[PDB]
Each structure stands twice: as C-alpha cells, then as structure tokens.
Amino acid sequence: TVLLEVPFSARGDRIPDAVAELRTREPIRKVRTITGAEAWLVSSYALCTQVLEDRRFSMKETAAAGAPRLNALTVPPEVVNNMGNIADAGLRKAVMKAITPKAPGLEQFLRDTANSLLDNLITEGAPADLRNDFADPLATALHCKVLGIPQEDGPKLFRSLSIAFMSSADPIPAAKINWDRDIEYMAGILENPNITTGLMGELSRLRKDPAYSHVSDELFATIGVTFFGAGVISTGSFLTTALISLIQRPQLRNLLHEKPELIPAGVEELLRINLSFADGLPRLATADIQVGDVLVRKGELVLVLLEGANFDPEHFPNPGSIELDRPNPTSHLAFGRGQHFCPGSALGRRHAQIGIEALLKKMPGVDLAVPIDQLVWRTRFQRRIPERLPVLW
Ligand code: HEM
Numbered sequence: 001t002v003l004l005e006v007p008f009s010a011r012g013d014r015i016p017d018a019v020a021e022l023r024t025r026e027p028i029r030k031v032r033t034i035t036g037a038e039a040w041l042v043s044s045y046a047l048c049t050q051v052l053e054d055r056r057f058s059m060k061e062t063a064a065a066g067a068p069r070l071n072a073l074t075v076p077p078e079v080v081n082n083m084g085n086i087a088d089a090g091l092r093k094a095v096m097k098a099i100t101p102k103a104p105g106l107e108q109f110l111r112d113t114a115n116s117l118l119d120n121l122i123t124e125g126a127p128a129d130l131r132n133d134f135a136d137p138l139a140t141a142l143h144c145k146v147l148g149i150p151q152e153d154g155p156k157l158f159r160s161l162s163i164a165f166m167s168s169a170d171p172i173p174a175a176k177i178n179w180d181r182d183i184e185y186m187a188g189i190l191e192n193p194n195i196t197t198g199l200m201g202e203l204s205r206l207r208k209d210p211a212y213s214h215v216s217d218e219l220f221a222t223i224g225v226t227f228f229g230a231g232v233i234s235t236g237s238f239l240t241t242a243l244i245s246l247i248q249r250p251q252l253r254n255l256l257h258e259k260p261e262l263i264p265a266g267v268e269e270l271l272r273i274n275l276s277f278a279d280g281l282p283r284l285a286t287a288d289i290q291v292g293d294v295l296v297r298k299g300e301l302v303l304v305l306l307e308g309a310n311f312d313p314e315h316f317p318n319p320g321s322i323e324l325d326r327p328n329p330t331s332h333l334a335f336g337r338g339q340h341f342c343p344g345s346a347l348g349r350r351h352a353q354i355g356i357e358a359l360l361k362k363m364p365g366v367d368l369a370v371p372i373d374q375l376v377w378r379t380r381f382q383r384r385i386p387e388r389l390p391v392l393w
C-alpha cells in the first residue's frame with residue numbers, strides 16, 4: 001500500500017470516519033499531498049493548537065523555493081506573507097478598522113441585500129440555488145461595500161475565484177492572467193477620485209499621506225485583491241455549507257426561526273462543525289520541534305486539520321451535535337489561531353448571522369429540493385462547496 005493521501009474527501013456534508021480513527025491512534029501522522037510531497041497531518045485539538053501558536057511553524061516559509069508543498073502557489077510568493085507586509089507598512093490597524101461589521105449602515109445594507117436576493121428567488125419560483133443566487137452574491141455585495149468599490153464590479157472580480165482558490169498540484173496559467181488583471185483593477189481604483197469610502201477609500205488616502213510615501217503601490221493594490229478574494233470565498237463557502245447543516249437539522253432550523261436571538265450561538269456552532277476548508281492549514285517548520293510523539297524536523301511541512309480539532313471529543317463533547325449552550329463556544333479553530341488568526345472574523349460572523357436570519361424569515365420551510373447525495377462537491381479546491389444548492393420552500 002502507498003502512503004495515506006490527503007485530502008480524504010471533498011464532501012462538506014459529512015466528516016469521514018478516518019478522521020476520528022487518526023485522531024485517536026495517530027494524531028500526528030505522515031501523509032502525501034497532491035504534489036507528491038510528504039507532510040505531517042495534525043488532527044487533535046491539543047496538537048493543532050500547539051502548531052498554530054508556535055511561530056516557528058511558519059506560514060511565510062511555505063512559499064520558499066524547494067519546500068515540500070501542499071499545493072502550487074496561485075499568488076506571487078511574497079503574498080503568502082500578506083499580513084506581515086501589511087504590518088511592516090504600518091497598515092494593520094487601518095485595514096482592521098475598515099473590515100469591521102460596525103460601520104454605520106453596513107448591517108442594514110446586508111439585511112436589505114439578503115432580503116432582495118430572497119425576494120427574487122421567491123418571484124422566480126422553486127427550485128432556487130442558494131449558493132449561486134444567494135450566499136455568493138451576498139458575499140460579493142458585502143465585500144464591494146466594505147471595499148468601497150462599485151457593486152457592478154463584483155461579478156467580474158468574483159469570476160476569478162473558481163481558479164484563484166484552486167488546490168492544484170501544478171501552477172495554473174489562468175491564475176496569473178486573472179491576478180494581473182485584478183491587480184490592475186485595484187490600482188485603477190486607487191487613482192479613481194470617486195472611491196472615497198471603505199477599505200479602498202482609506203488606502204487611497206493613506207497612499208497620499210507622507211507617513212506612507214514609501215509604501216509600494218503594489219502592496220496597496222494587493223490588499224484590495226486579497227481581502228476581496230479571501231473574504232468572498234470564505235464567507236460565501238461558509239454560509240453555503242452552514243445552510244446545508246441547518247436544512248439537515250429541522251429542529252434547529254425551527255428553534256432559530258422561533259428564537260432569532262439564538263442565531264449568534266447557532267452560527268458559532270455552525271462555524272465549529274464547518275468543513276469549508278478543504279485542506280489542513282500549511283506551515284513549514286523552521287526548527288526541530290516535538291509535536292506529540294513525532295520530532296518534526298526543520299524544513300518539513302505540517303498540515304493543521306481544522307475539523308480534526310473542531311470534532312475532537314476531548315475538547316467538544318458530543319462533537320457532531322450542535323449544542324447552543326457549550327461552555328467553550330468560541331474556542332473552535334474555524335478562524336485559525338495565533339499569529340494568523342482571521343482578521344475578518346467579525347465580518348464573517350455577521351454575514352452568516354444576517355444571511356440566516358433573513359432566510360428563515362422569508363423561507364421558513366426551506367428544504368433541499370434534491371437528495372443530499374446529489375450535491376456535486378467541487379474538487380481540487382481550497383474550499384469544500386456544492387456547485388449548486390437547490391432548495392424549495
Ligand atoms: C466565515 C468566514 C471566514 C472563515 C471561516 C475564515 C477562515 C480563516 C482561517 C482559518 C484563516 C487562517 C489561515 C491560516 O492560518 O493559515 C483565515 C485567515 C485570513 N482570512 Fe479569513 N475567514 C473568513 C472570513 C474572512 C473575511 C471576511 C476576510 C476579509 C474580509 C478574511 C480574510 C482573511 C485573511 C486576509 C487571512 C490571512 C490572515 C493572515 O495571513 O494572517 N477572512 N481565515
């Protein structure tokens with residue numbers, strides 16, 4: 001037999017039994033990735049947290065030439081260090097402030113957009129596709145608003161994402177074509193006097209402030225492309241797979257419909273059980289480090305399996321059940337942990353909370369319109385998502 005291959009399954013509606021078996025028997029284990037490289041797969045909560053909290057397991061160094069790779073880069077190697085570059089430029093605080101869900105009227109815009117999308121699906125009649133005609137457009141509209149760019153430019157930027165977030169064994173020619181085009185777009189945005197709000201409006205002002213005169217135009221444009229792409233793919237894919245988990249739990253769907261004040265706690269549990277990340281989070285050891293029973297050596301690749309941690313019964317008893325009264329509800333790893341913890345975590349929560357609130361009000365009887373096994377799971381991608389999510393109500 002050949003060495004165990006990752007990823008185990010592209011399905012986002014069920015966790016393979018192999019995960020709990022590995023976690024119990026071999027919570028750090030050698031595997032082979034799609035590139036042919038070997039890596040250490042970490043699958044318990046305790047070891048996942050250890051890796052993510054030790055900066056000697058480096059994100060930036062995953063991009064080094066000659067390193068064992070989870071997958072091929074779809075961005076320039078410097079962009080793997082995006083958050084470090086933002087910090088070095090003195091821009092971290094300003095970026096964080098621009099992506100909070102607390103801007104005036106942002107939540108009202110999200111509710112208005114979600115309700116408009118749902119009204120259009122109702123008018124058209126069932127079946128409706130909740131990914132392509134709800135979750136993704138809501139994510140795209142949110143990110144255009146947060147960035148300050150025209151809503152009408154969302155669709156073209158969005159069309160780059162089915163390639164940009166591929167998890168490929170080899171470089172992707174289309175990823176470069178789309179990247180260069182999207183960078184050119186954001187560079188034009190920085191020069192566009194109509195763009196005065198949101199993240200791009202703020203970056204456009206900082207760009208002309210003397211305290212930032214030597215920050216490169218490349219970085220300013222890159223911030224726009226990366227925050228659009230990462231935010232849209234992550235929120236769209238999370239909401240889509242959360243809606244599946246909700247539809248498959250009619251008792252919970254009815255509880256949240258009747259008591260919407262529980263939606264935040266329900267979204268936190270949906271984050272915990274979410275299988276949206278298709279691969280473990282990659283890190284390269286910069287030193288020899290003991291992790292459980294394995295001495296990881298300098299230069300080796302480690303993969304932090306989020307669902308390994310989030311379904312670990314030693315941390316979350318009865319892990320496959322959504323329970324709204326856990327004592328450790330936000331201690332999941334859905335947004336990562338440590339140096340690279342997701343900077344858009346609050347916006348991602350609010351996107352999902354508002355999307356679910358609106359859906360349950362407009363379509364309280366929402367149900368799958370096809371048997372669940374008929375969903376088509378995207379392969380070789382950095383997220384797990386169904387190509388279409390057909391529902392009736
Ligand atoms: C539910 C939605 C979201 C989920 C589940 C999610 C998940 C994650 C995870 C797990 C990481 C850690 C990656 C790693 O450590 O290797 C991360 C990082 C990141 N996320 Fe999110 N995310 C979401 C929403 C967003 C949003 C809305 C934005 C921006 C608008 C965003 C931007 C980023 C960026 C830029 C990073 C990289 C941070 C860094 O390298 O230090 N995410 N996200």
Ligand SMILES: O=C1N[C@@H](Cc2ccc(O)c(Br)c2)C(=O)N[C@H]1Cc1ccc(O)cc1
Nearest residue numbers: 075079080081082083164165225226229230
């Ligand atoms: O900001 C970043 N940090 C790192 C780490 C990272 C990688 C994949 C993700 O899913 C997440 Br989330 C984080 C990076 O390599 N790239 C960007 C995200 C990004 C944006 C647009 C793209 O086309 C491709 C990647």
